[PDB]
Amino acid sequence: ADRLIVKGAREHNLRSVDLDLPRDALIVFTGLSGSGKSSLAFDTIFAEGQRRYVESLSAYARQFLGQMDKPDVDFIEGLSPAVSIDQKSTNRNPRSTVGTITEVYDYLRLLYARAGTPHCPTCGERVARQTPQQIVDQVLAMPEGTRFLVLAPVVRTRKGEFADLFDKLNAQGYSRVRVDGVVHPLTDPPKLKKQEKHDIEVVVDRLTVKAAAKRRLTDSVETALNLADGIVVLEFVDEQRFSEKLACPNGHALAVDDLEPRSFSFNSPYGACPECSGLGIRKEVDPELVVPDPDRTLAQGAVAPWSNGHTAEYFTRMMAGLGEALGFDVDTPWRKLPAKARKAILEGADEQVHVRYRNRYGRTRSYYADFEGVLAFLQRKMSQTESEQMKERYEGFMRDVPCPVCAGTRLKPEILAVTLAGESKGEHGAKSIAEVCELSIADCADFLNALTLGPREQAIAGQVLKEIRSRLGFLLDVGLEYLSLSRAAATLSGGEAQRIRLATQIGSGLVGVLYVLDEPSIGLHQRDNRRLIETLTRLRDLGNTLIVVEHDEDTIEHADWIVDIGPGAGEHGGRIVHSGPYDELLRNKDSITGAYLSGRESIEIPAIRRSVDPRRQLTVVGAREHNLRGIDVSFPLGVLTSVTGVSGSGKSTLVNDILAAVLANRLNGARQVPGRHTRVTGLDYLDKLVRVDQSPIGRTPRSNPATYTGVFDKIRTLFAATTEAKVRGYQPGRFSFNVKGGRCEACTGDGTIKIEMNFLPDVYVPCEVCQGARYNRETLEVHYKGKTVSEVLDMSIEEAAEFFEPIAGVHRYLRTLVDVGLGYVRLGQPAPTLSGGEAQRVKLASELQKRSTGRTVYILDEPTTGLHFDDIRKLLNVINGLVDKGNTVIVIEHNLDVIKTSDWIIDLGPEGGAGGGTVVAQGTPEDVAAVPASYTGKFLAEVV
């Protein structure tokens, strides 16, 4: 058999399914959400693919593996080692960038280290080396009275164990050795791990720059230069480093010893920018809080940290308190008196101000304030003053910004001076990294370069240069041309992240692999779709075999074989509805998929659309943030708006970092940092903002649908207030798995335990003591309508909904969860196991569980995610419902149906990153399909 075969897969609601798949095909898994698609694809097939292979690695890791919950199948075979390509992790670590993620940056450092020449930062003369003598002369010329410790870094972070070395240093007695930070009396050194890299510097002298101490000055400096390989580092008291091999000709100091490849890593201290330490950024309070038009009243407030009841009454007073005392009152707009504004911001006059207050009873007749409560110090103060979430709440008046020293570049300047001489500029590695598009970098690295990669360096760095462009190549291929090497890894969308992984994997040149991909058409424009299907195929064609969980027409159309997964949701699914070619699937009358796919079903374009109100329009003005080009954009209120456009066009920066962040500030009063812009129009036409993020519901198995929606409180009471419970004296609290009495003590009531996996990813294994119940057995003695807590927590929501039809206080929450489509989800199903869409959808069911006051605004970022056709159809009703109450709903989408249904679309582009951040078209679908310049328009037009 050239076949992948599975018998009796039972992993979740999977009903002992058997499959006979064509290896060396692009297989696509398909069906309604919560069909079991993923349990089969990822939890069983892949999971086993990986496992069986890894078991080989070492007979040891074979044990470390033993402690996994091997997926529940009976027999599988024709199984290639598997590799997952989902969109699960968007790690927030600051230092890590595309460059780093793709290892491309790594190669860059080798390329720079070993070809292309360094320069001094100021004088700039090609950089020479330097004789111990004129290193003694530099230091002799120093400031008299300066005191510094001649220090010699014999070991610059290399690894070893240095017992022999410590002796040779007690051999001429030092007693002052710093290793790995901590200082050790060189009589008594520490034992070192030969395995860990190390940092051993001996103090050679504590000195001072007297004229005629020249003898010890000269006599120490030569010794350190000798003992630590020509490196002295004098570390002052009133540090500066000197290298034998790297020197400004004209005697400027250079703050970096070797030009070694690490010296480029803004992760190593050696290259990293000293100020921000290669973080690139500094959190730094903007003068931005404000609104220039409003000023100082309670109804008219100016200075944002100072707008309340007691806080507001208190500071307004003190402003005008100095405001006839500097002549600016409390009734001029912020953009009004230049002298006046610099006051509340800086320290200004610093003249005691008259503060009048009513005493504890009424007494009054006291007090001043030693200070104009200097505003930018209210900040430093209160960030310090109250330890809390509040601290981040105050942080909301600061803005990450590039570091002035390192220019944002996260780099020690001397490094920035190293230079690859190709065409217009021998741009720094960072100049190359910060290049606008992958193509921008590829062009210089790929062409502008080899053709002046000199005959010495072609021999020593030529291969490296090749390895780089190959890699840039594949990036273009996955259509990532538009981002830059230097972009932060965390910022990239799940799609973008995934699209990268695909570039890495496709390049890997691996054959015989089973790649299991999770919905890669996500966050990808309809345009780039047929492009990606190619890269997918060429991945198969290389000699691999794919399984793609998907609901996209084109991808499915293009599949070699299709498994359609049990019809219905949860219990109702988990069976192989279809498994065969595309045509054959169309024939299948039981495929909900086939229905839509054949045409028996569709989502129909509303014959009468919602009409837009010009007078009632929410408007972002002058959006400057990232690639947005100071645009003005108006979203019509009380209607369905899709923001569309290709990946990288600013869809997110607009709607999320600016449009949403403002509304959260102006309607729900979070103190959250909106992306740089001018302002937002009207806005008082709205009660509140609902941002249905796709972020996880919770990071712990503590968070549950029962918890999150808060139905569990209402159930814990239904339980405590029961015949069996009261006879035992059980309060509502015991039924809370969060709370010391009644929850199992081994899991602390989570039900499962996160067992660290080392090379493989960490995974939850059900607790042995509990079996994953959450509760100790005595607590489970208690029933309600013949079901314990664990049982009722285990119910599908759809199931629990019928079960609680009686208590309509609880039934409300459950109906909306069923309405939102999550019927199939288990009431107390650990939050970490929810798909970003499910999580999104749960949050959505929380606001549905509220009074729909006809002027609230909903922001749905890719709500289409992880949904089947039919699922979309259901969801759209939920949305029109919402909008028919006259609520405003704004949606970022690539999905055609959703777009073709919207009443208004805003199309950003034209391209991604640098090209883009403009409005390519806006109007009704009909209008936009009309704009020939619009990509969204192109596709939209085939449907309109």
Site residues, Zn ion (CB under 5 A) = 120, 122-123, 248, 250, 252, 273, 275-276, 403, 405-406, 744, 746-747, 767, 769-770
At 138, which helix (H) or strand (E)?
helix 132-140
Judge if the upstream peptide bond of residue 705 is cis by omega within 30 degrees of 0. no
Cβ proximity to Zn ion: between 183 and 746 the closer is 746
Cβ proximity to Zn ion: between 156 and 410 the closer is 410
Residue 881 marked as a ligand binder = no
Residue 650 marked as a ligand binder = yes
Cβ proximity to Zn ion: between 266 and 306 the closer is 266
Residue 96 marked as a ligand binder = no
Cβ proximity to Zn ion: between 410 and 651 the closer is 410
Cβ proximity to Zn ion: between 29 and 735 the closer is 735
Question: Which residue intervals of 589-735 are DSSP H helices?
Answer: 592-598, 651-652, 661-667, 705-708, 713-720, 723-726
Residue 740: CB minimum distance to Zn ion, A: 14
Residue 622 marked as a ligand binder = no
Region of residue 184 (phi > 0: left; psi between -120 and 50: alpha; otherwise: beta): beta
- Distance CA(429)–CA(626), nearest Å, equals 22
- Cα distances from 227 to residues 155, 157, 206, 414, in angstroms, run 10, 15, 17, 25
Compute φ and ψ for 183, nearest 5 degrees.
-90, 135
- Distance CA(156)–CA(148), nearest Å, equals 20
Residue 746: CB minimum distance to Zn ion, A: 4
Cβ proximity to Zn ion: between 340 and 428 the closer is 428
Residue (of 691, 640, 644) closest to 663 by Cα position: 691
Residues 102, 103, 107, 109: what is their CA dihedral angle, to the nearest 10 degrees?
110
Residues 913, 916, 922, 924: what is their CA dihedral angle, to the nearest 10 degrees?
-50
Cβ proximity to Zn ion: between 770 and 899 the closer is 770
Read off the tokens for 30. 């398909």
Residue 220 marked as a ligand binder = no
Cβ proximity to Zn ion: between 658 and 770 the closer is 770
Cβ proximity to Zn ion: between 225 and 767 the closer is 767
Residue 864: CB minimum distance to Zn ion, A: 38
Q: Give the torsion sign (CA, 191, 194, 195, 198).
A: positive
Residue (of 122, 233, 227) closest to 242 by Cα position: 233
- Distance CA(259)–CA(120), nearest Å, equals 12
Residue 642: CB minimum distance to Zn ion, A: 40
- The residues pairing with 75 across neighbouring beta strands, listed in sequence order, are 7
Q: Indicate the burial class of 90 (C-beta count within 10 angstroms; 0-12, 13-18, 19 or more).
A: middle
Residue 272: CB minimum distance to Zn ion, A: 8
Residue 250: CB minimum distance to Zn ion, A: 5
Residue (of 668, 605, 613) closest to 638 by Cα position: 613
Residue 66 marked as a ligand binder = no
Token pair 């070991």: residue: 155
Question: Angle, nearest 10°, between helix axes 438-446 and 455-477?
Answer: 150
Residue 736 marked as a ligand binder = no
Residue 140 marked as a ligand binder = no
Residue (of 525, 493, 496, 479) closest to 899 by Cα position: 525
Cβ proximity to Zn ion: between 122 and 678 the closer is 122
Read off the tokens for 15. 């009903």
- Distance CA(888)–CA(879), nearest Å, equals 10
Residue 366 marked as a ligand binder = no
Cβ proximity to Zn ion: between 159 and 283 the closer is 283
Q: Indicate the burial class of 839 (C-beta count within 10 angstroms; 0-12, 13-18, 19 or more).
A: buried
Residue type, 756: E
Residue 217: CB minimum distance to Zn ion, A: 23
Cβ proximity to Zn ion: between 444 and 793 the closer is 793
Residue 35 marked as a ligand binder = yes
- Distance CA(27)–CA(684), nearest Å, equals 51
Q: In this structure, what DSSP letter does residue 261 have?
A: G
Residue 114: CB minimum distance to Zn ion, A: 23
Cβ proximity to Zn ion: between 449 and 776 the closer is 776
Residue 923 marked as a ligand binder = no
Token pair 């330097």: residue: 130
Residue 33 marked as a ligand binder = yes
Secondary structure of 192-248 in HEC code, one letter for each residue: CCCCCEEEEEEEEEECCCCCCCHHHHHHHHHHHHHHCCCCEEEEECCCEEECCCCEC
CA–centroid distance for 10 within its chain = 34
Residue 645 marked as a ligand binder = yes
Residue 754: CB minimum distance to Zn ion, A: 13
Measured from the Cβ of residue 194, the count of other Cβ atoms closer than 10 Å reads 10
Cβ proximity to Zn ion: between 131 and 297 the closer is 131
Residue 257: CB minimum distance to Zn ion, A: 16
Residue 268 marked as a ligand binder = no
Residue 411: CB minimum distance to Zn ion, A: 8
Read off the tokens for 583. 């045509």
Cβ proximity to Zn ion: between 767 and 817 the closer is 767
Question: Which residue intervals of 428-516 are DSSP H helices?
Answer: 429-433, 438-446, 455-477, 494-507
Measured from the Cβ of residue 42, the count of other Cβ atoms closer than 10 Å reads 22
Read off the tokens for 204. 């050679």
Question: Which residue intervals of 849-895 are DSSP H helices?
Answer: 869-884
Residue 434: CB minimum distance to Zn ion, A: 14
Residue 770: CB minimum distance to Zn ion, A: 3
Binding-site positions read 31-38, 645-652
Binding-site positions for ATP read 31-38, 645-652
